[PDB]
Amino acid sequence: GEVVAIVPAAGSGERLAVGVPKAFYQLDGQTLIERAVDGLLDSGVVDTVVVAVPADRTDEARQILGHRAMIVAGGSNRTDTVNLALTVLEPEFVLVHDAARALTPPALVARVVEALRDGYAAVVPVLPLSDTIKAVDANGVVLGTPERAGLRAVQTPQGFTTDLLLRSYQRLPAAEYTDDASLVEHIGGQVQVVDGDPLAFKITTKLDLLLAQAIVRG
C-alpha cells in the first residue's frame, strides 16, 4: 500500500508575523517547507509528497523542492487547502502534515503509518497538556475547567485510509474545523491516538521560532 503525504503550506504567516508566509521562512538556511518535506521522506514510509502553497508561490515551491514533491495551490483556510490537495487524489493511506511542524522526527511519521498498517482507519499523534485548559466566553469570563487528564494536544502527521478521509472531506455549513481528524469524527469515524513527540511542535509564535533555531543550531 502506497502512502501519500499532503502538506498544507498555503497560510499567510499572519500570527508568527515574521514578514513572510511561514512555510517559506528560512530556518538556518532551509525553509520550513523544505524541512517538513525532508522529514516526511526521511521516515522511509512516505512514497509521495503533495505540498499545497499560496497560489503566487507555486513556482517558488517547485524551485525549492524539486522532485521531492508535487506542488499545488492551496486555499483561504487550512481546511480549504487540504480539500484542494485532496483533489490530486489512489493510495491506500494519506497523511496530512503541517509544514509548520518542520522539526517533526521521521520516527513519529513512521509510528503513525505503522498504526495505519495495524488496521486503525484514522490516527493522530497526541501529547498531554502542560497547561490547565479552560472554557472562556467572549467577555473573558471563565465558563469552567474540563478535566485536563481527559484531554490531549494533537499534532500532525494525522493519518487516514484514503477512502475515509475523502468521504469525510466530502460530507454543518457553518463549521469550522481546525484539523483533519475533526471531519472524520464528524461522520462517525473512530480515531485512535498514538504518542506524539515534543519535537513535532508547531512553529506558531516567535518563541517557537526561537526554540526551533536552538534545536537546529544545537
Ligand X SMILES: C[C@](O)(CO)[C@H](O)COP(=O)(O)OP(=O)(O)OC[C@H]1O[C@@H](n2ccc(N)nc2=O)[C@H](O)[C@@H]1O
Binding positions for Cl ion, rule: CB under 5 A: 11-16, 22
Q: How far is the CB of 180 from a second copy (least distance, A)?
A: 9
Cell numbers describing residue 163: 477512502
Selection from Mg ion, ligand X, Cl ion, none that 14 binds (CB < 5 to 8 A by kind) is Cl ion
Residues forming beta bridges with residue 7, ordered by sequence position: 51
Q: Is 52 in the site for ligand X (CB under 6 A)?
A: yes
Give the 3-state secondary structure of residue 178: coil
Please answer whether residues 22 and 15 qualify as being in contact, where contact means their C-beta atoms are separated by less than 8 angstroms: no
Cell numbers describing residue 18: 515574521
41-80 burial string, b = 16+ CB within 10 Å, else e?
Answer: bebebbebbbbbbbeebbeebbebbeebbbbbbbbeebbe
Q: Is 34 in the site for ligand X (CB under 6 A)?
A: no
- Per-residue mark of binding to Mg ion, 10-49 (x: CB under 5 A): -x--------------------------------------
Q: Is 176 in the site for a second copy (CB under 8 A)?
A: yes
Count Cβ atoms below 10 Å from residue 145 Cβ, excluding itself. 10
- Per-residue mark of binding to ligand X, 134-173 (x: CB under 6 A): --------------------xxx-----------------
Count Cβ atoms below 10 Å from residue 185 Cβ, excluding itself. 15
Q: How far is the CB of 121 from ligand X (least distance, A)?
A: 18
Q: Is 202 in the site for ligand X (CB under 6 A)?
A: yes
> Which residue ranges make up the site for ligand X (CB under 6 A)?
8-11, 15, 22-23, 52, 74-78, 81, 98-100, 131-132, 154-156, 178-179, 202, 204
